């Protein structure tokens, strides 16, 4: 009888754990997508501002400015 | 009976968690869009002011001004 009751409550636990982890996996995938989108856009505007600034100052001057 | 009641309250919890996380994902996506818009506009006006100033002072003078 203990075996029958443990079988029922184990099936009932495992279905809930399956559904919760499935929806959590979908939501974590969407958060990852938004995360890398923000990372690459902020990296792109950083790269573009740096490129325009070191273009406007000239790469020859930065060769002999740090010392 | 414990299994039936856990199934009902698990379905009822998971629908709410699904809807809350979906609308939160939409709102976080919009905040990311506004965030990168502000970052790139302030970076653009920084780059443009720096370029005009180092144009007006001349890149030859900044070669021999730091020392």
From Swiss-Prot, chains A, B:
Modified how: Phosphorylated on Tyr residues after EGF stimulation.
Induction description: Up-regulated by IFNG/IFN-gamma.
Compartment list: Cytoplasm; Nucleus, Nuclear pore complex; Cytoplasm, Perinuclear region
Disulfide bonds: none
Tissue specificity: Present in most normal tissues. Higher expression observed in epithelial cells with secretory and excretory functions, as well as in cells chronically exposed to xenobiotics, such as bronchial cells and cells lining the intestine. Overexpressed in many multidrug-resistant cancer cells.
Source species, domain of life: Eukaryota
Domain notes: MVP 3 mediates interaction with PTEN.
General function of this protein: Required for normal vault structure. Vaults are multi-subunit structures that may act as scaffolds for proteins involved in signal transduction. Vaults may also play a role in nucleo-cytoplasmic transport. Down-regulates IFNG-mediated STAT1 signaling and subsequent activation of JAK. Down-regulates SRC activity and signaling through MAP kinases.
Subunit-structure text: The vault ribonucleoprotein particle is a huge (400 A x 670 A) cage structure of 12.9 MDa. It consists of a dimer of half-vaults, with each half-vault comprising 39 identical major vault protein (MVP) chains, PARP4 and one or more vault RNAs (vRNAs). Interacts with TEP1. Interacts with PTEN and activated MAPK1. The phosphorylated protein interacts with the SH2 domains of PTPN11 and SRC. Interacts with APEX1. May interact with ZNF540.
Protein name: Major vault protein
Organism (species): Homo sapiens (Human)
GN (gene name): MVP
